Amino acid sequence: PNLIQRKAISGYAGFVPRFAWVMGMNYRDGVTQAMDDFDKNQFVFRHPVCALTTIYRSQGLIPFYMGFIPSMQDNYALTFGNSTRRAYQKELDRRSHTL
Amino acid sequence: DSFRSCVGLKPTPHRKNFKKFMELDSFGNISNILRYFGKLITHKCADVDR
Amino acid sequence: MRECISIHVGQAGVQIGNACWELYCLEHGIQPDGQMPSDKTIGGGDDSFNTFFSETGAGKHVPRAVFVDLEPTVVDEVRTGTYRQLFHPEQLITGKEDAANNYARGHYTIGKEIVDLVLDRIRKLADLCTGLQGFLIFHSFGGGTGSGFASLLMERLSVDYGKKSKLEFAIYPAPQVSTAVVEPYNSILTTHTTLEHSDCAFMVDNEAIYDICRRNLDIERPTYTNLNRLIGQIVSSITASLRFDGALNVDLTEFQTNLVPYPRIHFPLATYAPVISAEKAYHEQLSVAEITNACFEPANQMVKCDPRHGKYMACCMLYRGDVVPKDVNAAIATIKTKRTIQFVDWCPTGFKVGINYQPPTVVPGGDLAKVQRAVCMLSNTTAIAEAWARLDHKFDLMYAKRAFVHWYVGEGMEEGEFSEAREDLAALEKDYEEVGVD
Amino acid sequence: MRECISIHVGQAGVQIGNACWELYCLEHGIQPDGQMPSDKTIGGGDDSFNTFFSETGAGKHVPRAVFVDLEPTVVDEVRTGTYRQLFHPEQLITGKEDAANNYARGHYTIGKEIVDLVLDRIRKLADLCTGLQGFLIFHSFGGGTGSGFASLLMERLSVDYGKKSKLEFAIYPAPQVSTAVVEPYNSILTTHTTLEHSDCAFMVDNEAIYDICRRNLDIERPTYTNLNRLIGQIVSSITASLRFDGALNVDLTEFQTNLVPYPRIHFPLATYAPVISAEKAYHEQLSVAEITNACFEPANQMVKCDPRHGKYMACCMLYRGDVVPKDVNAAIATIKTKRTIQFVDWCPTGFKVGINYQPPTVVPGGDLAKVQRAVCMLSNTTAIAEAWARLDHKFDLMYAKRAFVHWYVGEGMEEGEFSEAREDLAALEKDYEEVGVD
Numbered sequence A: 001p002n003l004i005q006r007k008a009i010s011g012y013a014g015f016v017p018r019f020a021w022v023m024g025m026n027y028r029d030g031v032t033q034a035m036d037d038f039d040k041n042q043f044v045f046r047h048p049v050c051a052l053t054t055i056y057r058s059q060g061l062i063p064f065y066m067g068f069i070p071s072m073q074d075n076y077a078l079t080f081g082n083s084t085r086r087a088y089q090k091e092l093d094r095r096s097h098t099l
Numbered sequence B: 001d002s003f004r005s006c007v008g009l010k011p012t013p014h015r016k017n018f019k020k021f022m023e024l025d026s027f028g029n030i031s032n033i034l035r036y037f038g039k040l041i042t043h044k045c046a047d048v049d050r
Numbered sequence C, D: 001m002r003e004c005i006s007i008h009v010g011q012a013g014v015q016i017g018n019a020c021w022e023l024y025c026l027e028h029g030i031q032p033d034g035q036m037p038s039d040k041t042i043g044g045g046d047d048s049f050n051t052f053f054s055e056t057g058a059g060k061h062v063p064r065a066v067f068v069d070l071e072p073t074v075v076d077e078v079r080t081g082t083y084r085q086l087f088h089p090e091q092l093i094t095g096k097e098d099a100a101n102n103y104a105r106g107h108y109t110i111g112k113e114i115v116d117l118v119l120d121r122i123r124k125l126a127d128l129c130t131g132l133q134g135f136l137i138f139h140s141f142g143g144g145t146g147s148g149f150a151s152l153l154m155e156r157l158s159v160d161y162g163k164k165s166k167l168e169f170a171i172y173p174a175p176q177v178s179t180a181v182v183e184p185y186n187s188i189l190t191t192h193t194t195l196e197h198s199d200c201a202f203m204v205d206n207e208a209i210y211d212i213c214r215r216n217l218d219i220e221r222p223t224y225t226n227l228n229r230l231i232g233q234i235v236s237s238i239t240a241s242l243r244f245d246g247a248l249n250v251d252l253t254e255f256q257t258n259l260v261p262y263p264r265i266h267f268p269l270a271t272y273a274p275v276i277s278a279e280k281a282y283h284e285q286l287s288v289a290e291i292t293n294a295c296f297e298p299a300n301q302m303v304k305c306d307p308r309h310g311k312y313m314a315c316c317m318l319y320r321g322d323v324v325p326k327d328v329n330a331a332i333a334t335i336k337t338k339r340t341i342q343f344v345d346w347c348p349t350g351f352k353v354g355i356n357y358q359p360p361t362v363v364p365g366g367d368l369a370k371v372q373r374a375v376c377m378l379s380n381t382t383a384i385a386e387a388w389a390r391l392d393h394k395f396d397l398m399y400a401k402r403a404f405v406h407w408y409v410g411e412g413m414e415e416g417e418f419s420e421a422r423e424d425l426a427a428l429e430k431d432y433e434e435v436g437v438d
């Protein structure tokens, strides 16, 4: 802090920790988030002697989608909108290995 | 329609809100119409039967 | 009044009868049990349902239909299904032996001893009928049974009743997809036996329905749950004018008088424009202009014939839902002025418009849409003669080699009729050619 | 009424389209679901959206756009974004095969069997529309596929309609950066095919965009989110005249009729002066004089052409937000008095000024700050000849060594176009100096 820790005065000819990793946005938010990481790792190695998927939502998906989710073709005879929406729930019951 | 013309220079074709129509309309065996059953009145009611 | 009699001849007719009837019961609220709870639509048996039901002294809506079949399997499955209790017990006429794809098998060996029963049933329906506009008969040309039996029934009811009406709808065999090399045989036999009694027959194609189903409805593995519900929608569309009222109405007598130009030629085509699924209806737009454009799109049809290979002489618009005459006439005028369509000079106008206010209705577990504007297309053109050239050359080689003829001679067939068939077909051919000529 | 149809062909056009429609929905206040809040603006398709979105009886503002893409990956991603219920399903035309950076692979082997579908879409828009002022086509030249199929669609739309404007944006090939080496080949092919059909083709460069980014956005590591956002705000500015109102007004037809001098040469450049950040706008302040000076600062334009190495001839200034005309005309007069700038004789009047009062809008969580005054600058000057000089003394070496022509000829092409393009370009540059001289 002193003056500001959320920001370090634009055009800061000095440097900061946490240069790599989360980066590629505007400046001030990067400053905030990076110093948040700098005290996170701080207390994490402090730890003193501890030993002491929007792709699918409610009503399925648009027509002409590619990418095999389990099944379909094995089951059929329904409107593709239905088919997708009913797979949206039976992907919880029998093909429940989808997470 | 007179009010439709009471908007601007050019017309525009308003219509009934379809939302109400979906959420209130008989589909399947479920009707959505209710039915009342009463007797006509005159000074002296005669065809009270119907 | 305004009431009609349905005939369902054959394996195929009786099922789509079941499906369309399952439609019919909904839009008047008739339950799978056939009785409403306390509310009242009953009366002197005389109200909107009276077109197809006659709810008699037991408060049960009775179909104005008949179902005749040879193999008892499917009549059994519908006698054990969900609607046997509503279907009238002995109307559902069953046999014990098939027709074996032979026309003369249904026309000389089996159909004789059942026609008596079926005519008795239809007369004891006709007595209780009053208006009796006509008969909606469902058969199929390549019918694995029904073709021969339908020929006999149709000709006898034509000869005994020459004043009432006859309308024929039939799934037409495909240009290239085959289920029977024998299909050309009974197709040509039925044609040369029926063209002189059928008032108007209307053909559609299963492949075409399927092609629609995976272009627009987005159905990649249909069945005819789907496609029978489609055809049921079609017939409900043509009969909505009968059922309801409105600004101005249309009738089957008008169809008879105004669709067909000449004797013999009575073969139009049928289409339904706003075939559309859930999400497309939900978040897209429909109106008279674009739906008319679509219904006149050349690939929407149920039989593969190219309109640039043809020429139009008649069209019938069935506008159901919320549509209005101004945009009706504007759309049809624009269509006229458009030059892709090439109307003959016979009819300066070529259009018959019909109106009904009541919107079409959806069905549970279905594919159709909450459509407010529907339009049924019934148009007669000249593109179809290609198909009859197709059939005759699909037939000529195979007859010249005479495959399977031993079957027919064994069951009691000769070859004069087979000879006669092709010149009947060539007659229809040159007739289409000449009427096109101008 | 007052509407334009959006077309995005490609890898090169998907992300910029995503950004620009996100900004559109944000600024009109559309919820990404599609409908309005309890405010009453859903109607017969006629309010501020009547220019961009087709909000129909369904109540959903439907963009009037079509994306066509050769490689289904990115289009699947865009359908798996969030605005999928907003966008129209079959307006998202996807394929299964890339054009593989080959101009002729794109234009011949795969494209032709897709133009039928894209034409069907555009005509089913052409029927509904009434104003149809023109199109917004997005593609590139350094595109693996945005080149050839784009050329073919341009050709068909030109041949069917010559009665509407044709606006083209382009991310131009980088002068000294070349991600692809097929870039010069397919780029010059696109140019020489498109010169005789394009109304207004405009360019911008990624390198200079980044240079602005780390100059005054204070972003040494920006992204596509940022680049596409900038270009989207640019096009929003050029369409602000259509959307909102103002004191004096201009239209894209005026842009064409009043910026291009002659036949052929119709490739000007663009700029947006007030590119600054939150704290910058916070404790700094913008005004008309310095926005003019900044927008004519030699570095601020997004292509590496020095104006002092060229000569101005045309300028169109679009100011948006609050402004008085006094300072506007005074500042442009002072720039007329300026001695570093260069105007050719032909254009004593060269300033098309256009005002809209509505302030430009911000995107949440983005980089750009609040804006009180903003400007889009469209200038045409002789300077850009050096870029084509570069391109020609590049392509000449590859032709001298006949490099990579084997792919094109093996998929079936001949030297004719390869030869012709060089003197097409040469005619272009020679006209450039012919008009630059006096």
Ligand SMILES: Nc1nc2c(ncn2[C@@H]2O[C@H](COP(=O)(O)OP(=O)(O)OP(=O)(O)O)[C@@H](O)[C@H]2O)c(=O)[nH]1
Pocket: C009, C010, C011, C012, C013, C014, C015, C016, C017, C071, C098, C099, C140, C142, C143, C144, C145, C146, C147, C171, C206, C224
């Ligand atoms: N209406 C209807 N048609 C069906 C059904 N299942 C298959 N089909 C159609 O029936 C048509 C063929 O009927 P046919 O093979 O001639 O049947 P049939 O001669 O009446 O007698 P069967 O031996 O029982 O088949 C085909 O075009 C199929 O599309 C069904 O359940 N109902």
Ligand SMILES: Nc1nc2c(ncn2[C@@H]2O[C@H](COP(=O)(O)OP(=O)(O)OP(=O)(O)O)[C@@H](O)[C@H]2O)c(=O)[nH]1
Pocket: D009, D010, D011, D012, D013, D015, D016, D071, D098, D099, D100, D101, D139, D140, D142, D143, D144, D145, D146, D147, D171, D179, D180, D224, D228
């Ligand atoms: N237009 C555009 N170009 C970009 C963007 N990011 C990078 N580029 C450049 O644009 C070019 C894209 O060209 P292509 O890859 O040929 O695009 P395409 O021809 O439509 O098809 P693909 O090669 O399959 O992706 C790349 O060479 C990049 O140098 C961007 O967001 N938009």
